[PDB]
Design a protein around this ligand. Structure first.
Ligand SMILES: CNS(=O)(=O)c1ccc(Nc2ncc(C(F)(F)F)c(N[C@@H]3CCC[C@H]3N(C)C)n2)cc1
Length: 263
């Protein structure tokens, strides 16, 4: 057998966009069985520090070990020469843009479905007490109109407007902080990709939160779902639902929204 991937197997065709560590390219990987897979090929800047070259790899190896239908798929790794991380390519791009573009067609059913899918990826991460620091629509890829995948990165310049009080105040990041951030992501989804607290500056966020003030319900967000978001935004992290519970609740909301739309 010829397990793993050879640099021969992979051709670069165009720029995709800059990733945290370096440019990412669109290309085509040719299978062990001759199939052509479209791929996003991540690279690390040649001039970056050893600590950065090591984090790039550290993240890669974790992504290699993760296996969830709603987390971006790592196909392989070429360590040598210019290191290439070969990910599956998701043709529809980032959820936030996809939502902005399709805001007049998307039904609430689908928005709840994307929320549920991300919540399942998070319940998996919670089962290993892996914390994801970037559960946001910019960092979720659209595999198909009915499938989203949580991004790699986030598995200075912090996403203040997505962070729990404890994160902002003490740089504490736990599962419960991820629950808070995940509800913010639900809010972006149900708002068709608006930025949370777009009407504030970063410095003003914590004070508003400390006041008990919260993102308001998006127009098309079901009240039941907003109540759910609201629980995820409990100031006290012990009082927030776990991800396993949220999967159950969101499953119910999803099944309800489905019934409503089919009849
Ligand atoms: C939405 N923007 S776009 O330029 O149209 C586009 C933007 C991505 C894509 N596919 C795409 N597919 C897979 C991946 C990933 F590497 F698996 F995560 C990916 N990563 C993005 C590329 C560099 C940054 C990272 N984003 C998610 C933060 N991207 C296809 C089109």
């Amino acid at each position: 057998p010829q397990y793993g991937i050879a640099r021969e197997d992979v051709v670069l065709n165009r720029i995709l966009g800059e990733g945290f560590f370096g440019e990412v390219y669109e290309g085509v990987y040719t299978n062990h069985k001759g199939e052509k897979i479209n791929v996003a090929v991540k690279t690390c800047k040649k001039d970056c520090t050893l600590d950065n070259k090591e984090k790039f790899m550290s993240e890669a190896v974790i992504m290699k070990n993760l296996d969830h239908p709603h987390i971006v798929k790592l196909i392989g790794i070429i360590e040598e020469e210019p290191t290439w991380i070969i990910m599956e390519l998701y043709p529809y791009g980032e959820l936030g843009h996809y939502l902005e573009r399709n805001k007049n067609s998307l039904k609430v059913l689908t928005l709840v479905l994307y929320s549920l899918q991300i919540c399942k990826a998070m319940a998996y991460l919670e089962s290993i007490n892996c914390v994801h620091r970037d559960i946001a629509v910019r960092n979720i890829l659209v595999a198909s109109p009915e499938c989203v995948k949580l991004g790699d990165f986030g598995l200075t310049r912090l996403p203040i407007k997505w962070m729990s009080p404890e994160s902002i105040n003490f740089r504490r990041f736990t599962t419960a902080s991820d629950v808070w951030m995940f509800a913010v992501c639900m809010w972006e989804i149900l708002s068709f990709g608006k930025q949370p607290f777009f009407w504030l500056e970063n410095k003003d966020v914590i004070g508003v939160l400390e006041k008990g003030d919260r993102l308001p319900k998006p127009d098309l967000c079901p009240p039941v779902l907003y109540t759910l978001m609201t629980r995820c935004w409990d100031y006290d992290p012990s009082d927030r639902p776990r991800f396993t519970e949220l999967v159950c609740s969101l499953s119910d909301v999803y099944q309800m929204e489905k019934d409503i739309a089919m009849e």
